[PDB]
Amino acid sequence: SEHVGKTCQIDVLIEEHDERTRAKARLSWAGRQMVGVGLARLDPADEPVAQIGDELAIARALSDLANQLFALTSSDIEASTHQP
């Protein structure tokens, strides 16, 4: 006591359309499926690569999910107090 931690996995999918690569980052949290969605871009042409589009999409997906988790934190904080 007190050493207990826990383990999640975030499942990332990257789909390249084109132009036009999209990432989805899915987290199961507090009994809800949370999905961050990110989109690139690039550019049209030429073209790049590939890794650039993927990593930018993932970055935007994770930001989205982070922002959703920040919104959940605030909501929960506000729920915990007030309690009148």
UniProtKB/Swiss-Prot annotation:
A Pfam family recorded for this sequence: Rv2632c-like
Domain of life assignment: Bacteria
InterPro entries per record: Rv2632c-like, Rv2632c-like_sf
Family: To M.tuberculosis Rv1738.
Full protein name: Uncharacterized protein MT2708
Species of provenance: Mycobacterium tuberculosis (strain CDC 1551 / Oshkosh)
